[PDB]
Write a protein that binds this ligand. Structure first.
Ligand SMILES: Nc1nc2c(ncn2[C@@H]2O[C@H](COP(=O)(O)OP(=O)(O)O)[C@@H](O)[C@H]2O)c(=O)[nH]1
Lengths: 370, 97, 44
């Protein structure tokens, strides 16, 4: 099962580039797309090496980079341009689709901060559900007239994208000043590319459990509505050190409340005899709170680092606190609704997200059923 | 003698390899293999799926999708059976020696 | 003549079905059937 990526706007093409650098570094792949001398299945992302990239100004500098051999501002205008090149761009997708053995998903790297890609992102997801109804789509959207373009794409992402990994630049810059002391764009993305790289540690390296993209998502997302995730990455030393440093709100990449499911990926060679002990100490101290209705647990799996390149770890969670972020956005909309052909699509968009904000607040009650 | 007997096993006959290889196949540690063997067999479900023309060949189709193996160790995986099923349950008896 | 062409049909088609009946009953000798019929024909 092969995976293919799409990068839109200025943001998606930037972080996706460094995502291609860091991933190409994990394997023994020279910048010139040639294997050097110097186990790891490199066929899911690379096709004989050629990466399955689809890039939609900065592209000129991208080819000017040493990795050349590796291949308006409104929302409606971003949606219009996507319609003007409907068939022209789509041929690239189809020829890459069936030319591949068995497509599994569609990784989408894009921003919703008022860019032409933000609309461009809204269009592709509509058609991706039109043509291929049996193909999962994952999107690593990133959060910041900015209220407008933000709340609109949320209307499409809640019914087309079967998964989503949110990344807000606000909580990122807090990490930038504190533990890197920058006071730039190419500076914060250094850590962002790290999150995505380790996010697919269980895919590029074979393991027992979770050997496919449906193996990770099916456990966390309980319903096609509550389909929002957050990430964590602690190394910036035993197992009880990792999981305890992950649950802190100082590390989460997000600006009652409880968890639904957690996933912790350990990449080190740590002694696996103590992984159950760390699970006991986290329970007894009661450092995290779960749902009361159904039995919700925390899962951990192991894998191995790139031998070419120390204990790392990733935390993936579905927290109902993500509802607060939306409330920050939609509140700005009502304020911009009273201050400034039909303006009816903006109505149903505001309408459908307010159903989602109702769906989260209802999950925290012991009687969420019915 | 004993120290030379045990050493003869590792550095010449790769006893350390056989263990870390049978685990790749029997205990289903290597993904993309069990997720490709079981996925094939489960696509069918009697007289079919029991002759040596399908189950003795589904393995030779499975190892290609393993991306790990195809070595002298990888052979000798006799995907045989030990019972003839007649006809919703959770049982499908089949060995792998 | 017109009564002989149809006579060859019932005679040849019956002989062909005897082949795939014996070519199938075995433990390649099985991939030959996939070469004889490709459209699911001769599924009798
Ligand atoms: N997180 C992150 N966001 C970025 C980066 N570069 C640009 N952005 C976001 O992208 C937005 C600008 O979009 P723009 O490039 O003008 O859209 P385009 O011109 O249609 O591609 C800003 O609001 C930024 O928040 C980056 O390196 N990291």
């Amino acid at each position: 099962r092969e995976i293919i990526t799409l990068q839109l706007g200025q943001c998606g093409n930037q972080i996706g580039f460094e995502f291609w650098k860091q991933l190409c570094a994990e394997h023994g792949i020279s910048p010139e797309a040639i294997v050097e001398e110097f186990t790891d299945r490199k066929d899911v992302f690379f096709y004989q090496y050629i990466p399955r990239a689809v890039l939609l100004r900065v592209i000129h500098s991208i080819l000017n980079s040493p990795y050349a051999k590796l291949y308006g501002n409104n929302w409606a205008s971003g949606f219009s341009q996507g319609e003007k090149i409907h068939e022209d761009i789509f041929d690239i997708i189809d020829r890459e689709a069936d030319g591949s053995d068995s497509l599994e998903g569609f990784v989408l790297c894009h921003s919703i901060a008022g860019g032409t890609g933000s609309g461009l992102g809204s269009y592709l997801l509509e058609r991706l559900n039109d043509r291929y109804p049996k193909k999962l789509v994952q999107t690593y959207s990133v959060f910041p007239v900015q209220p407008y373009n933000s709340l609109l794409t949320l209307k499409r992402l809640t019914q087309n994208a079967d998964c989503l990994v949110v990344l807000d630049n606000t909580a990122l810059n807090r990490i930038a000043t504190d533990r890197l002391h920058i006071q730039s764009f190419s500076q914060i993305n250094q850590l962002v590319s790290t999150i995505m790289s380790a996010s697919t540690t269980t895919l590029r390296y074979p393991g027992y459990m979770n050997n496919d993209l449906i193996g990770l998502i099916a456990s966390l997302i309980p319903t096609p509505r509550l389909h929002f995730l957050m990430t964590g990455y602690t190394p910036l030393t035993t197992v009880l050190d990792v999981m305890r440093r992950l649950l802190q709100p100082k590390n989460v990449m997000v600006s009652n409340h409880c968890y639904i499911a957690i996933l912790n990926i350990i990449q080190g060679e740590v002694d696996p005899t103590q992984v159950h002990k760390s699970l006991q100490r986290i329970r007894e101290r009661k450092l995290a709170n779960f749902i009361p209705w159904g039995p919700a647990s925390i899962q951990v799996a192991l894998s191995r680092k790139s031998p070419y390149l120390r204990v790392s770890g990733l935390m993936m969670a579905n927290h109902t606190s993500i509802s607060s972020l939306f409330e920050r956005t939609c509140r700005q909309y009502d304020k911009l609704r009273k201050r400034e052909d039909n303006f009816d699509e903006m109505d149903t968009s505001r309408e459908i997200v307010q159903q989602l904000i109702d769906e989260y607040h209802a999950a925290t009650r012991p009687d969420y059923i019915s | 003698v004993n120290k030379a007997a045990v050493d003869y096993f590792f550095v010449e006959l790769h006893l350390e390899a056989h263990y870390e290889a049978l685990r790749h196949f029997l205990l289903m540690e290597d993904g993309e293999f069990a997720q490709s063997l079981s996925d094939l067999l489960f696509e069918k479900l009697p007289g079919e799926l029991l002759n040596p023309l399908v189950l003795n060949s589904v393995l030779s189709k499975a190892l290609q999708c393993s991306l790990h193996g195809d070595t002298p160790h990888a052979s000798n995986l006799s995907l045989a059976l030990k019972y003839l099923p007649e006809v919703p349950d959770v049982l499908s008896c089949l060995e792998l020696r | 003549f017109e009564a002989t062409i149809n006579k060859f049909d019932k005679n040849f088609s019956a002989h062909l079905l005897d082949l795939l009946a014996r070519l199938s009953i075995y433990s390649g000798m099985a991939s030959v059937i996939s070469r004889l019929d490709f459209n699911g024909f001769y599924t009798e």
